[PDB]
């Protein structure tokens, strides 16, 4: 069911880094990873948490639809793309933390905790501040647990409406061409050691789906582009994409 290929470590070590990629072949119900231990180690989700947060906000009506405009609060932040209005699509695309912090305040602790438990999401622990627990609170999730959660979303099996799941999967759209579609979300965790980058999602093909979850050490922001680059290089190696 699970196979470890330690030769894939080269994708990380050649960049003087360390990490894990986890792949799941949906048709064959088989998983692959370079590091079984790290595949099951739980890290802060950071901005990959925008997937469940979006689902919960939509299903409770905190967010009406993917067109609703969330106005900039007028506080200048150091990420230029955050200093403007957003909807759910652009907020996901540019990982706009302060929009999602307001979602969480409106969701509230009680409803947030119940929904993460319904989702079987990570350790289901929201200890910390309700507007930042996914950045520096007690919540943790592993790469294998990310895949488990994403598969439920793909099949519309999470305990929210089908509409909420279709909208979030639209907002996860990252890349599409004549060969494949990638729906995914990046993450960057810096407030608690070890600092890591995430990329989780799936690749749609004509006749199969491949789910993926990766994290890697990220001592500086200079390596963030390696999250997608390494993942796609593994996918090309395994001939999942050309
Ligand atoms: C410490 S931070 O202000 O949260 C911070 C520092 C550097 C970068 C980012 C960031 C912002 C938006 C998108 C992405 C990204 O990796 O797609 C990354 C956030
Ligand atoms: Cl779409």
Report on the architecture of this protein.
- It catalyses: a beta-lactam + H2O = a substituted beta-amino acid.
- Keywords: Antibiotic resistance, Hydrolase, Plasmid, Signal.
- The protein has one domain (1-242): DD-peptidase/beta-lactamase superfamily (Beta-lactamase), CATH 3.40.710.
- It is 35% helix and 19% strand.
- It contains ten helices and seven strands.
- The protein has helices spanning 10-13, 36-39, 50-59, 88-93, 97-107, 109-119, 133-136, 143-154, 162-171, 226-237, and strands spanning 2-4, 19-25, 30-33, 173-176, 181-189, 196-204, 209-217.
- Strand 5 and strand 6 (196-204) form a beta hairpin.
- It is globular.
- The relative contact order is 0.19.
- Residues 78-79, 94-95, 186, 188, 190, 221, 224 line the site of 3-(3-methylsulfonylphenyl)benzoic acid.
Q: Provide the helix percentage.
A: 25-40%
CATH-scheme architecture: 3-Layer(aba) Sandwich
Largest sheet geometry: 7 strands, mixed
Strand segment count: 7
- In DSSP terms, counting alpha (H) and pi (I) runs of 4 or more, how many helices? 10
Q: Would you give the CATH topology?
A: Beta-lactamase
Total separate domains = 1
């Amino acid at each position: 069911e699970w196979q470890e290929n330690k030769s894939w470590n080269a994708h990380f070590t050649e960049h003087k880094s360390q990490g894990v990629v986890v792949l799941w072949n949906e048709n064959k119900q088989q998983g692959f990873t370079n590091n079984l231990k790290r595949a099951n180690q739980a890290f802060l989700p950071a901005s990959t948490f925008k997937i469940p947060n979006s689902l919960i906000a939509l299903d409770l009506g905190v967010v009406k639809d993917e067109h609703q405009v969330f106005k900039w609060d007028g506080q200048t932040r150091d990420i230029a793309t955050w200093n403007r209005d957003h909807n759910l699509i652009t907020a996901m695309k540019y990982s706009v933390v302060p929009v999602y912090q307001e979602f969480a305040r409106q969701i509230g602790e009680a409803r947030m905790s119940k929904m993460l438990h319904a989702f079987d999401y990570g350790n289901e622990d929201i200890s910390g501040n309700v507007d930042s627990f996914w950045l520096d609170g007690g919540i943790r999730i592993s790469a294998t647990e990310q895949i488990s959660f994403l598969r439920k979303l793909y099949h519309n099996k999470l305990h929210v409406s089908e509409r909420s799941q279709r909208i979030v999967k639209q907002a996860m759209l990252t890349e599409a061409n004549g060969d494949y579609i990638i729906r995914a979300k990046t993450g960057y965790s810096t407030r608690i050691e070890p600092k890591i980058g995430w990329w989780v999602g799936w690749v749609e093909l004509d006749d199969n789906v491949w789910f993926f979850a990766m994290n890697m050490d990220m001592p500086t922001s200079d390596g963030l582009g390696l999250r997608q680059a390494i993942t796609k290089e593994v996918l090309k190696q395994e001939k999942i994409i050309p």
